[PDB]
């Protein structure tokens, strides 16, 4: 049976009830509040532990599985699809935030390019590079935080090289195939424990809210973000799927419902990858090669949810201050916020350090994060859900458009 | 011939003579004293270098060698045996320190649980996590020091997964078998050079003592620690072995004498692992699978020596201050000190950072370490000797109790 | 065709022209000067990224390819040749700097020995150990910077062990062979992009010079360094080659011209390794085993260029100050400067941190580096060229002297 998903839904409702009841009838200190959310912290720690080998081995295996003379077209189609979806999401978010009205960059882009080619493979696993101008000379240094962008680029190049090697790279191909399978099984073992961590995480999230008037004050900001995400998930993506693939998009969404729920629950596209693989390969008759190549790329560089969430939050923050913007300032903020997070799109994010960096770069005060940090728990899950839905639709579209390429391999 | 052990014994006696003669007839500055112990520092550095791959590959290989439907009972028996021995050692140490009379915790336990599941596999190889309460909110950060506990847990889970994989994980199994053999050979190469390092280490240890009245002042503390270790090694462990295995325990100890001497000399259970393997498999007719699985686990979570040494030292320090304790305070100190070192029990320890953390947590002053740091050289070697003796007895007991399981594999 | 080398030469001349024209006709701020050299920084970053796996896998593969009973003599001959060449270079540099007249150590040597045996394999990939005396007690700590010396020693020991293992180490041998080939191919991919980075690097180097009288002031220092390098490359090395191998040394140099140009262009002996392999194995009929073993060792511990460059620069700096030296002080400075860089001789060096450490140790002021940092761009390339020429001549000499050993393998 599907005991994991039912248990997780029961844990979610029980955690909501527990948080509400404890907040209403019990008074706890800050230390007790921190101690009440320990299982959720343990679950988040376990989820973080498995991100590196899973994504690295999946990328290498997916790239190496394709023929040398074929992978270029598939990759080109994937990047074109993701760029188009990100542009549409950016436009929709800008239009919605302008209409509803709810309420340094060069260094950031150069750092983004710098992180694509790290100076140390081992150091990139837990550290990132950043520069700042001081009196003017540029000074750079390394700070904690996994450099997923550089590891993904190196993994892609390495997978291409060992796929083109042939008989001399077969041992590496087999090694990374076995590593990918082992990481998948370990992820399943962690999924076994997930529900209790989710229960306590929801209870702690609800308990941490103290004012209870922040939700009332944050009117039309939740409405704006939710409306943008709903429009993107329900209208634009199914229309693109039907236009390219002459098939019903909602049967496709019905097949992926299990992965959609899982992603909505753990809020981690990279973690959900095994369920997405299974749903896309079994429930829908999508080729294994296309799925295994496209899905990690989507979990890495999908920016529709970021464009519909962080960009809107930034424009709302700028609107809170009497800092009336122009068309250029709004477009610059949306571009900076969307581009600054291109590296880490699958890892779980709670502190929104990328958006803090964006706020610092665009000159806005960095102390306004607290006014929206309370509702991040609710919004991030829907962001991840729409991200994985877009990834699945992209796998379907690329499989549709790669008929000749998949014919040559046979 | 056995030229390594005879050479090491000759080096030990020559180092004792050299240290005594240099202290008596020569006067050296602090810088010259530091320069006199350089070869011992080099030997310790080389021993530290080989701890990670050896323990990781040994754990993976030992776990993967067992059948999937069998390893649960073997692991359960091993943990039960180690828990029982640790409890007996704790009780004996408490009783002895109370009778002879020679002279924050929640955060520590939560950190112990946190380190079982690190957030980064690469970072866990050289860094550890720690939290502290400040004005109250909890703040955590990473500090230098290998996280053996997390690596051991991940290695166990990975070994189980790849053992259950079968034909798809055979390549990883072969890879880690070869890695384990290579690490063993490198350890043997280091053992070739060991004796000169031991000579200079003993000479430097003896030279560093300056007062020469600290030994007289530290009366009944050496007596207490040595009596506890001797009682545990000579009475309790052989009695348990004879009760479970109806055989003479001293022939077993006679067979393991080579590994016992080696462990007494280098004071590193993990380093002694190859000699322990050879003695337990050849001198005693113990099954290879049981040995290869139990011995790394013992080298990792054996706490009898820690309970008989650090706990007693802590109670002695608390007795030095006019800080008359109760039964609860003594039991809390013994439990905290024993549990805080569960991660690093095989690596060489000289600075006793774990006991410093324990003293900080139990509210005792941290400046009293110097009064006992002088005799650590002598006591740590006997602690390691009794630890490896307990590990060997545990291998024998588990092999005795696993007759049906070892019958199914055949 | 040879489009890469011709494109790189055209890029070099175009970068020289661009730098001269921009300096003469345009005025730029410091920030614009930094932004003008971004592609060169990206190229240097990519070159740095590939140094670790390439050198590690090449060392392991080269050591493991040789028979167990043979590799000792080959290694002995290689070390003897490198020691003799370094001694001759030291003598020549000292004599030239004394005649032309253009213008703490114990801790350094002990740190050099300490870095040969690191305490952590993972930490050695990006960190180094250093000690300092303070009031006297010695305090050590770790700082950023790859520890190539320790990794090379561990790789050599590991390669010997797995070569002696045989059928049980064949899987590791195959794994590292495949890894070496993959790293070579990735290096070739980077070489594809190299020329534009070289163009912008030369343009930025030329632009950064502002006084334009520093070249006139630095008279007889360029002359001394260039004369020493030219004498070493043209006279001493061909004479040694002809004395040992009764063959024309200039046909050998003509065969290696492609690798010589490449090394002169990128100034990185380790990066040039694939071209050196191809030229030495195809253009000259040198045995593959001798080449694959000797060349990484030369790229790691070749000190002729360092002895002819850093030692002379240090003596020139000491001559600038009215600090008249003796024979012992000059020999101590040359020995310290040559020995302090034994670890990193193949990686690209621009900041000359090793020479800064040498200046700090020998008591000379550390602020005089700026007076010679301007001409480092020009001199380092010739230093690397003579280093790779010496490495190739060493491969030839060792192949000549290893006739019996290469006969036994057949």
Author numbering:
A (entry chain B), B (entry chain C), C (entry chain A): 17 to 119, 137 to 168, 200 to 474
Publication text:
iOFS-K+ and iOFS-Apo imaged in the KCl and alkali-free NMDG buffers, respectively, have similar structures and feature well-resolved HP2s closed over the substrate-binding sites, although the hairpin conformations differ. What are the structural correlates distinguishing translocation-competent and translocation-incompetent states? iOFS-Apo is structurally similar to iOFS-K+ (RMSD of 0.52 Å for the transport domains); both feature apo configurations of the NMD and YE/DDR motifs. However, in translocation-incompetent iOFS-Apo and iOFS-Na+, HP2 residues coordinating K+ and Na2 and residues 414–417 at the start of the HP2b helix unwind and form an enlarged loop with an opening in the middle (states highlighted in pink), resembling an unzipped purse. The potassium binding to iOFS-Apo and glutamate to iOFS-Na+ zip HP2s, increasing their helicity and decreasing dynamics, as evidenced by the better-defined HP2 EM density of iOFS-K+ compared to iOFS-Apo. In contrast, deprotonated E374 of apo EAAT3 is engaged with R447 and cannot stabilize the helix, necessitating K+ binding to zip the hairpin. Comparing iOFS-Na+ to iOFS-Apo structures, we observed that sodium binding led to M367 in the NMD motif shifting into the binding pocket and R447 in the YE/DDR motif shifting out. Thus, in contrast to iOFS-Na+, iOFS-Apo cannot bind and translocate glutamate, preventing the dissipation of the glutamate gradient. In iOFS-Apo and iOFS-Na+, E374 is solvent-accessible through the unzipped HP2 and likely deprotonated with pKa-s of 6.5 and 7.1, respectively.
Human excitatory amino acid transporters (EAATs) concentrate the neurotransmitter glutamate and aspartate in cells. By coupling the uptake of one substrate molecule to movements of five ions—symport of three sodium (Na+) ions and a proton and countertransport of one potassium (K+) ion—EAATs ensure that the cytoplasmic glutamate concentration is ~10 mM, which is required for neuronal functions, while the extracellular concentrations are as low as a few nM permitting rounds of synaptic signaling. EAATs are homotrimers composed of promoters that work independently. TMs 1, 2, 4, and 5 of each protomer comprise the scaffold domain mediating trimerization; TMs 3, 6, 7, and 8 and helical hairpins (HPs) 1 and 2 form the substrate-binding transport domain.
